Design a binder for this molecule. Structure first.
Ligand SMILES: [Mg+2]
Ligand SMILES: [Mg+2]
Ligand SMILES: [Mg+2]
Ligand SMILES: [Mg+2]
Ligand SMILES: [Mg+2]
Ligand SMILES: [Mg+2]
Ligand SMILES: [Mg+2]
Ligand SMILES: [Mg+2]
Ligand SMILES: [Mg+2]
Ligand SMILES: [Mg+2]
Ligand SMILES: [Mg+2]
Ligand SMILES: [Mg+2]
Lengths: 121, 129
RNA sequence: UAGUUGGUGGGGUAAAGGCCUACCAAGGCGACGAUCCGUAACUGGUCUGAGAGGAUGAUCAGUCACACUGGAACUGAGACACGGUCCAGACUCCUACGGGAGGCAGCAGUGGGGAAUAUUGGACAAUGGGCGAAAGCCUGAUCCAGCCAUGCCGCGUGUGUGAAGAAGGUCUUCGGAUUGUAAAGCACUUUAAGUUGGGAGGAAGGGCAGUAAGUUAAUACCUUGCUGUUUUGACGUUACCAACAGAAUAAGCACCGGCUAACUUCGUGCCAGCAGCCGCGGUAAUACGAAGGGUGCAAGCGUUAAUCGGAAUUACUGGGCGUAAAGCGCGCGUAGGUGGUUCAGCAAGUUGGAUGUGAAAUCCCCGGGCUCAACCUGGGAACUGCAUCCAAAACUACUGAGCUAGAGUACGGUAGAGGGUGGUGGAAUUUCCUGUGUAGCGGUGAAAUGCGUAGAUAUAGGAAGGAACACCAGUGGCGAAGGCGACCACCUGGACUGAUACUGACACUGAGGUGCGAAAGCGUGGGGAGCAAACAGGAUUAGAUACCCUGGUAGUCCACGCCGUAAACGAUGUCGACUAGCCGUUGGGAUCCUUGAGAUCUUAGUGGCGCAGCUAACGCGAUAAGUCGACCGCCUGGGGAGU
RNA sequence: GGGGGACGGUUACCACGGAGUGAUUCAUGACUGGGGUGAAGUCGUAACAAGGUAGCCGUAGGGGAACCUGCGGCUGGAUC
RNA sequence: GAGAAGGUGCGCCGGCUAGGGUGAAGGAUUUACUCCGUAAGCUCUGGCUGGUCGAAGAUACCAGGCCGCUGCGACUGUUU
């Protein structure tokens, strides 16, 4: 474009938005849980992923993901969620911190214990 | 209706050194007749002649040190509609000081090596290698 | 938008003003974005970047705005006043029920919210403020301690010797390899932490006494030099120094399939699980879970959140538009952008210089202090700016005068389906009339529906009516594009070509705005030959709304008005200038020996090949997508959606 | 005694509050219109070769659904 | 639609201040059923400021109830 057009209508830089729309500019967030589904992934895998649905303190009702190897998460129990985009499942955009409030980590684990929250033997 | 005369003198020079011509003849002015004087003293053409009466011409003879010509590129800087003005600090240097750059100063049309010695800025015209 | 925008007269305030009022006048602002909506305290600076820029305004500093909510004035040098006054409201508390009281967005602290943020400290010794200057008195600003790996910078967790290469571990071709001089063993070392002793600097003063100067009428008082004497520290067990103990007091965290430094066994078998992207796992997994080994960093390491880089991915520096996304359907034209050629003037741009400024800090450079560094600090540069003066005059602007190469006019002359209004033809189709004549016609891969002795098709004669315009006809013409083919009259636009005079830059492009817009369709009125969506029947067909067959209405045609889109195509905006060739063709002048089936050259069109050059390639290539200018339109992953 | 002053009275200005009619913005609503995805399933076979009737673009009419037909345009059209 | 809805002003007594219309004392002169044009008067409009009286100022008779959804018939009209 010529110079005499950019004087009349300057170059307006396009903007993005957050891939984590909930927890507005904060790294963690707590919420109480509602339902513990066990859903199935997309096509090229085969598994049965474990998904909980959380109502935060913002009022939002978003699904989440639970890692590890076994969870004690009965309903109406507080958790502490954080971001993280699971490629496999649809609609899942949040992980869940282990060992923080109620989830209490995992057991008999000796590689990468600061992830999943395990102590030192 | 041509809007810029001096970007037409430089266009005929660049084209004639691909048809391997020797003499080029374009209409003249009191600015084009001063630019070709500068290209002669730096040395890119042979000579030039202002030879007519009511449509005065400019006949330029070109050089060939090789099959490749002596001028390899040339571009207009202060195109009409940009009007590039430079002081002595921000005055450019082409190819580490091996090309020439023609700057219209307060003391006449002179090259970049001359006005920087005199300390007079001005308006750039072209960057001939 | 009606104190709204000016004027006048009078008030009002430290001070100019519609600040206020009384009449006068009908103005003012706006596409250079007023008005309105949504959000946000700005700035010196911080964070990235090579740079241009991009985000962002914690601590420190300057300015503004508030002090439970909404008002209002007083006092005063100066407030429309955070610990003042009055009022209204909301909310707590007191009461003898009549009435009262209060405002932590001061320092601590509690409750609440939250992913998340500290002690109800110590003092006036220092620097400062207020009052009194006579010392003193106040100070939750200051100066200091407490808490928290919250960050940057520094130091420890020992050093040397030591191969029977020990056990022990893991792997193995069963030979060994590896953990590994690493341990153990032996010889030394003691910073920090612990313990003991010592120990500055932050202190300037004040009191008291003495003395000398000047004040004076009176060296009485008092002020000032100076001397002498006495007194003062929150920090504080100060930094710092010496001695003693002994190797004792002190290492994790992620990762190891590719990007990417670093690997093999054991469980598991499309399960559990992994993941920043590619993607691994179905019975041998260097990707899941473990075990050895190894690599990165260290008093920290990892994930998440959030900005700038990489992103030439909003391209000013620094990109694109024939087919990848991207050139309006074409014109004319206002605001605006750009300007052929000679002088002359001027100095608004432009360059050079001087002065005033651009707070201090921060960043950068050279130094100086803390055992080093972070940290503190002296001097300089810089802060790209804005303003006032002085000079230069090439280019742009402005002004004055010219010139004819752009552009336009006058004069001959050709070529054309360029428009509009009427008129007139000939061939063919159909309907109708009439004669002759008599059994099928028509249709199709093949048939059937249909039409026929109530005389069809054929064939001859006649009448009426409607629309299209063979051959010429061609990469041929004309038009701004859509478009435009019978012949003649009638009005009427522009282009070509030659000669010659004149005007003397009168030009280009064009957001908004104005027009002309195929076909289908829509409105009122005409008109009804053929063709033919919708439809009807036959056939084909598992099925056939479809293709094919026999029929057949709106429409196609005309007048008037509307709609505005198309593969509206050269998938290529308009305008101007340069760049090897060859073969065609429309129209027009040339030159030329002349008989030419002539010759060559030159403009205005329209075609086929082709060198440089460009292009991702295909391919364009004097009718550019080549080399360059002036203005405009437009593009930013696919769907969602031109919705 | 005058002058002057205060207090009362009264007008102006003004906050709270009350009234009517509008905008605009979120929160939600029986039933409806599409879109994206999925992995089962049914009905077909429209498009890509002359995809078995050459495709597409505009427009109208019709149809379970891809789509079919009409009028005009296009080569991004292949056989000769 | 619509005088939608809905709201304010209104009495007497003065103080000022804009006019409007007739008119004629005179002149123009066409000299007479003529053109222009005053004063004073009567008359009809208004303006902006004071005072004042009452629970009450279009003080009596006189004279719109308004708005939101929906059926049917375009309307004014005519009919036992
Ligand atoms: Mg960069
Ligand atoms: Mg506090
Ligand atoms: Mg001391
Ligand atoms: Mg030790
Ligand atoms: Mg593993
Ligand atoms: Mg960039
Ligand atoms: Mg134009
Ligand atoms: Mg500074
Ligand atoms: Mg076309
Ligand atoms: Mg197009
Ligand atoms: Mg009725
Ligand atoms: Mg009756």
């Amino acid at each position: 474009a010529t110079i005499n057009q950019l004087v009349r209508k300057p170059r307006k830089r396009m903007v993005d938005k957050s891939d984590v729309p909930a927890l507005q500019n904060c790294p963690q967030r707590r919420g109480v849980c509602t339902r513990v589904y066990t859903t199935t992934p997309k096509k090229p895998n085969s598994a049965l992923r474990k998904v909980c649905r959380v109502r935060l303190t913002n009022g939002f009702e978003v699904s989440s993901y639970i890692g590890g190897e076994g969870h004690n998460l009965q309903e109406h129990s507080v958790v502490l969620i954080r971001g993280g985009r699971v490629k496999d499942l649809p609609g899942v955009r949040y992980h869940t911190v282990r060992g923080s409030l109620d989830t209490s980590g995992v057991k008999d684990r000796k590689q990468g214990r600061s992830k999943y929250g395990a102590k030192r033997p | 209706s041509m809007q810029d005369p001096l970007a037409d003198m430089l266009t005929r020079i660049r084209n004639a050194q691909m048809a391997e011509k020797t003499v080029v003849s374009m209409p003249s002015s009191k600015l084009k007749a001063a630019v070709a004087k500068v290209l002669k003293d730096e040395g890119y053409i042979a000579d030039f002649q202002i030879s007519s009466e009511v449509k005065p011409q400019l006949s330029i003879e070109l050089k060939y040190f090789e099959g490749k010509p002596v001028i390899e590129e040339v571009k207009r800087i202060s195109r009409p509609g940009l009007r590039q003005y430079k002081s002595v600090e921000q005055l450019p240097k082409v190819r580490g000081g091996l090309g020439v750059s023609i700057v219209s100063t307060n003391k006449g049309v002179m090259t970049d090596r001359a006005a920087r010695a005199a300390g007079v800025g001005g308006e750039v015209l072209c960057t001939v290698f």
